[PDB]
Design a protein around this ligand. Sequence first.
Ligand code: HEM
Length: 146
Amino acid sequence: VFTEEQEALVVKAWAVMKKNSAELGLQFFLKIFEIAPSAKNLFSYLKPEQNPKLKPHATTVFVMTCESAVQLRKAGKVTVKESDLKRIGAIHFKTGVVNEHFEVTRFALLETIKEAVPEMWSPEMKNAWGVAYDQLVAAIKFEMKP
Ligand code: HEM
């Protein structure tokens, strides 16, 4: 169960990091592609890793993760609109985003956060971010079908 403490951690960390989300987004994607260069292929428009569209995807991940933390504490579930979730779910399903991609991204997300606010980093900070993300992903994965 997602706690008020974990919510506070995600909310404040994001509050801090959000001041430099430009540097943060670039770092995040550079981490994703350092680990799995071939993940590049999934973003069909990539065929510099400088691409315009990559920066908002990065921040979406951050914002929606922080939002899930809030909703999880408030209502005990991800309460993202049923329709936003179907739409996000379908695109990921159709471009071939698989578990390993979500998983590389989780790992990249945590590293990016550890590097960005090393002064707020701790295993509870890591887990709070990790769990909000996991619940967000599971809400999306339920909508990854035909
Ligand atoms: C919490 C995790 C994630 C969230 C919240 C999220 C959210 C979103 C959103 C809101 C869009 C808008 C795209 C649209 O409606 O056309 C999108 C697109 C997309 N995402 Fe994600 N996403 C996540 C994970 C991932 C992962 C792990 C990958 C693969 C590395 C990925 C790759 C893509 C691709 C290829 C698109 C389509 C881009 C395009 O065709 O212009 N996403 N995502």
